[PDB]
Write an enzyme that holds these catalytic residues in place. Structure first.
Site, PDB file in Angstrom:
ATOM      1  N   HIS A 276     -11.667   6.433   2.873  1.00 48.85           N
ATOM      2  CA  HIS A 276     -11.610   7.798   3.395  1.00 48.85           C
ATOM      3  C   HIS A 276     -11.575   8.818   2.297  1.00 48.85           C
ATOM      4  O   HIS A 276     -11.007   8.565   1.222  1.00 48.85           O
ATOM      5  CB  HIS A 276     -10.336   7.962   4.257  1.00 48.85           C
ATOM      6  CG  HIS A 276      -9.078   7.428   3.617  1.00 48.85           C
ATOM      7  ND1 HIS A 276      -8.193   8.261   2.921  1.00 48.85           N
ATOM      8  CD2 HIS A 276      -8.591   6.159   3.594  1.00 48.85           C
ATOM      9  CE1 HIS A 276      -7.215   7.471   2.506  1.00 48.85           C
ATOM     10  NE2 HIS A 276      -7.437   6.191   2.842  1.00 48.85           N
TER      11      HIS A 276
ATOM     12  N   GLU B 293     -11.092   1.491  -0.006  1.00 47.88           N
ATOM     13  CA  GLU B 293     -10.341   0.306   0.368  1.00 47.88           C
ATOM     14  C   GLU B 293     -11.194  -0.641   1.132  1.00 47.88           C
ATOM     15  O   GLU B 293     -12.055  -0.214   1.902  1.00 47.88           O
ATOM     16  CB  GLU B 293      -9.091   0.617   1.200  1.00 47.88           C
ATOM     17  CG  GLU B 293      -9.279   1.613   2.324  1.00 47.88           C
ATOM     18  CD  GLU B 293      -7.953   2.061   2.895  1.00 47.88           C
ATOM     19  OE1 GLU B 293      -7.043   1.213   3.025  1.00 47.88           O
ATOM     20  OE2 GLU B 293      -7.809   3.271   3.172  1.00 47.88           O
TER      21      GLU B 293
ATOM     22  N   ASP C  73       0.882  -1.184   0.000  1.00 48.92           N
ATOM     23  CA  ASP C  73       0.000   0.000   0.000  1.00 48.92           C
ATOM     24  C   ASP C  73       0.907   1.218   0.000  1.00 48.92           C
ATOM     25  O   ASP C  73       1.604   1.477   0.977  1.00 48.92           O
ATOM     26  CB  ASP C  73      -0.860  -0.029   1.284  1.00 48.92           C
ATOM     27  CG  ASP C  73      -1.960   1.034   1.343  1.00 48.92           C
ATOM     28  OD1 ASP C  73      -1.927   1.993   0.526  1.00 48.92           O
ATOM     29  OD2 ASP C  73      -2.859   0.892   2.160  1.00 48.92           O
TER      30      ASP C  73
ATOM     31  N   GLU D  90      -7.237  -1.410  -2.839  1.00 46.62           N
ATOM     32  CA  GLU D  90      -7.603  -0.008  -2.664  1.00 46.62           C
ATOM     33  C   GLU D  90      -7.369   0.739  -3.956  1.00 46.62           C
ATOM     34  O   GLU D  90      -6.345   0.545  -4.607  1.00 46.62           O
ATOM     35  CB  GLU D  90      -6.685   0.623  -1.602  1.00 46.62           C
ATOM     36  CG  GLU D  90      -7.012   2.061  -1.279  1.00 46.62           C
ATOM     37  CD  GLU D  90      -6.233   2.560  -0.077  1.00 46.62           C
ATOM     38  OE1 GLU D  90      -5.154   1.988   0.232  1.00 46.62           O
ATOM     39  OE2 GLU D  90      -6.717   3.512   0.570  1.00 46.62           O
TER      40      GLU D  90
ATOM     41  N   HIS E  89      -6.320  11.738   4.866  1.00 45.52           N
ATOM     42  CA  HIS E  89      -7.645  11.460   5.416  1.00 45.52           C
ATOM     43  C   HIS E  89      -8.307  12.789   5.736  1.00 45.52           C
ATOM     44  O   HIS E  89      -7.944  13.451   6.698  1.00 45.52           O
ATOM     45  CB  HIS E  89      -7.625  10.402   6.552  1.00 45.52           C
ATOM     46  CG  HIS E  89      -6.864  10.725   7.808  1.00 45.52           C
ATOM     47  ND1 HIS E  89      -7.526  11.134   8.962  1.00 45.52           N
ATOM     48  CD2 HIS E  89      -5.565  10.484   8.122  1.00 45.52           C
ATOM     49  CE1 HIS E  89      -6.590  11.226   9.904  1.00 45.52           C
ATOM     50  NE2 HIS E  89      -5.399  10.842   9.451  1.00 45.52           N
TER      51      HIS E  89
ATOM     52  N   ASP F 221      -3.772   6.952  -3.487  1.00 47.32           N
ATOM     53  CA  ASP F 221      -3.710   5.968  -2.425  1.00 47.32           C
ATOM     54  C   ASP F 221      -4.270   4.708  -3.054  1.00 47.32           C
ATOM     55  O   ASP F 221      -5.431   4.663  -3.409  1.00 47.32           O
ATOM     56  CB  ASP F 221      -4.559   6.452  -1.248  1.00 47.32           C
ATOM     57  CG  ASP F 221      -4.451   5.526  -0.068  1.00 47.32           C
ATOM     58  OD1 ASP F 221      -3.784   4.473  -0.201  1.00 47.32           O
ATOM     59  OD2 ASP F 221      -5.069   5.827   0.976  1.00 47.32           O
TER      60      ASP F 221
HETATM   61  O1  HZT Z   1      -6.091   4.090   8.468  1.00 47.96           O
HETATM   62  S1  HZT Z   1      -5.949   5.481   8.252  1.00 47.96           S
HETATM   63  O2  HZT Z   1      -5.333   6.360   9.177  1.00 47.96           O
HETATM   64  C1  HZT Z   1      -7.594   6.060   8.092  1.00 47.96           C
HETATM   65  C2  HZT Z   1      -8.584   5.433   7.468  1.00 47.96           C
HETATM   66  C3  HZT Z   1      -9.786   6.107   7.484  1.00 47.96           C
HETATM   67  C4  HZT Z   1      -9.765   7.276   8.116  1.00 47.96           C
HETATM   68  S2  HZT Z   1      -8.152   7.580   8.742  1.00 47.96           S
HETATM   69  N1  HZT Z   1      -5.301   5.685   6.732  1.00 47.96           N
HETATM   70  C5  HZT Z   1      -4.616   6.920   6.300  1.00 47.96           C
HETATM   71  C6  HZT Z   1      -3.134   7.005   6.575  1.00 47.96           C
HETATM   72  C7  HZT Z   1      -2.684   7.424   7.808  1.00 47.96           C
HETATM   73  C8  HZT Z   1      -1.333   7.515   8.061  1.00 47.96           C
HETATM   74  C9  HZT Z   1      -0.428   7.183   7.077  1.00 47.96           C
HETATM   75  F1  HZT Z   1       0.891   7.264   7.322  1.00 47.96           F
HETATM   76  C10 HZT Z   1      -0.873   6.776   5.841  1.00 47.96           C
HETATM   77  C11 HZT Z   1      -2.225   6.692   5.587  1.00 47.96           C
HETATM   78  C12 HZT Z   1      -5.579   4.586   5.808  1.00 47.96           C
HETATM   79  C13 HZT Z   1      -4.488   4.197   4.856  1.00 47.96           C
HETATM   80  N2  HZT Z   1      -3.206   3.885   5.136  1.00 47.96           N
HETATM   81  C14 HZT Z   1      -2.632   3.582   3.951  1.00 47.96           C
HETATM   82  N3  HZT Z   1      -3.546   3.703   3.040  1.00 47.96           N
HETATM   83  N4  HZT Z   1      -4.639   4.060   3.576  1.00 47.96           N
HETATM   84 MN    MN Z   2      -6.336   4.518   2.278  1.00 46.42          MN
HETATM   85 MN    MN Z   3      -3.608   2.960   1.046  1.00 42.63          MN
END
Ligand code: HZT
Ligand code: MN
Ligand code: MN
Length: 360
Positions: free
Chosen positions: A213, A246, A133, A341, A221, A144
């Site tokens: 998101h 996702e 990812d 995703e 996000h 993303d």
């Molecule tokens: O789980 S999450 O924090 C989230 C999902 C829904 C609301 S906030 N998030 C975002 C993120 C947060 C921090 C990162 F360093 C990178 C991405 C999902 C995600 N990670 C990778 N791809 N997608």
């Molecule tokens: Mn994501």
């Molecule tokens: Mn992602």
């Protein structure tokens, strides 16, 4: 002019006048394909084009990754090889073009947010189920997009289930669509799958506390969540919004919890300027502001900038609420998790799955 093997030519140099390939264009679910809408869509062409350039980098990087990712490589070797390619294709240029967030390579019952820190000796195994990812961006327009890597065919039906659930989420998404309806639709498709792995049968479970998101400029996000189970919010998707759709499927409890050493961090988008006098904490925050801004980063990315013995300064920024940690998210020991995703653009005229490829 033409892409090399291995990829090394920036996507911007593969296109003559800055017009990048569109992703998959879809009619919205049950008049837009409208002069008012066509003009409104055209008014954001430079923005869509930035997403498309980042999406083309994402497609070329992931195809290259799939050609060489193999058991025996360390997780560090995988991430460094992927990131080196991603930096070249996006033509990394400070906050103008670059890596949107660290390369997730979460394994097995770990569903997300795992990237190795320095010193991690983890080696990818034949029976591992690895979620790659990663994100790219142009001018903070983030792609993303993620897929699941396996070597043992025993996970094929689990991957098929999750891919179908993600595609179901993508198809259901639209302007004025209730977020809760997307979650219900994803869950119905994911639960329609039964799989057999090592002589045990499972009905695939959506990971209930994982979600899609909305995406904002330099904001992975942006505030709205896309559930992957029933019972969510009737809040609607709106014209001009961008979403990461996702889904995650699991053979475990279908719930994740924080586990393992944290690697991912990101400045809180809403926190204002905070004067810091503590020298090491001040220096680290300046490094973060200069290199990442509000984009996520990882410890390896601070190491590569020549920062060392920064863990206390990093903890200070987390404790002050300036930076938030995002630790790995795992289901129960022995469970298997899979993910797919994509990034979608809710354009005034159509829905564009901008990160779609010939792969997924
Ligand atoms: O789980 S999450 O924090 C989230 C999902 C829904 C609301 S906030 N998030 C975002 C993120 C947060 C921090 C990162 F360093 C990178 C991405 C999902 C995600 N990670 C990778 N791809 N997608
Ligand atoms: Mn994501
Ligand atoms: Mn992602």
């Amino acid at each position: 002019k033409v892409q090399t093997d291995p990829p090394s030519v920036p996507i911007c140099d593969l296109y003559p006048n800055g017009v990048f390939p569109k992703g998959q264009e879809c009619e919205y679910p049950p008049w837009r394909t409208s002069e008012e809408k066509k003009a409104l869509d055209q008014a954001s062409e430079e923005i869509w084009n930035d997403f498309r350039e980042a999406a083309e980098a994402h497609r070329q990087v992931r195809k290259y990754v799939m050609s060489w990712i193999k058991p025996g490589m360390t997780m560090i070797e995988i991430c460094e090889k992927l990131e080196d390619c991603s930096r070249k294709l996006i033509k990394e240029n400070g906050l103008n073009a670059g890596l949107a967030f660290p390369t997730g390579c979460s394994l097995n019952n770990c569903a997300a947010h795992y990237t190795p820190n320095a010193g991690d000796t983890t080696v990818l195994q034949y029976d591992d189920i690895c979620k790659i990812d990663f994100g790219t961006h142009i001018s903070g327009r983030i792609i993303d997009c993620a897929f699941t890597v396996t070597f043992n065919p025993k996970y094929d039906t689990l991957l098929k289930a999750v891919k179908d659930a993600t595609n179901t989420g993508i198809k259901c998404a639209g302007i004025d669509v209730r977020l809760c309806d997307v979650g219900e639709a994803i869950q119905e498709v994911m639960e329609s799958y039964e799989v057999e792995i090592d002589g045990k049968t499972y009905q695939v479970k959506p990971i209930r506390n994982l979600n899609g998101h909305s995406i904002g400029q330099y904001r992975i996000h942006a505030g709205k969540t896309v559930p992957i189970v029933k019972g969510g919010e009737a809040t609607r998707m709106e014209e001009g919004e961008v979403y990461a759709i996702e889904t995650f499927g699991s053979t475990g409890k279908g719930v994740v919890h924080d586990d393992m050493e944290c690697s991912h961090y990101m400045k809180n988008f809403d926190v204002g300027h905070v004067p810091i006098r503590l020298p090491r904490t001040k220096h680290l925050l300046n490094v973060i502001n200069e290199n990442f801004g509000t984009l996520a980063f990882c410890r390896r990315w601070l190491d590569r900038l020549g920062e060392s013995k920064y863990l206390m300064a990093l903890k200070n920024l987390c404790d002050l609420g300036i930076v938030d940690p995002y630790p790995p998210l795992c289901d129960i020991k022995g469970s298997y998790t899979a993910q797919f995703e994509h990034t979608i653009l809710l354009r005034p005229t159509c829905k564009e799955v901008v990160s779609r490829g010939d792969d997924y």
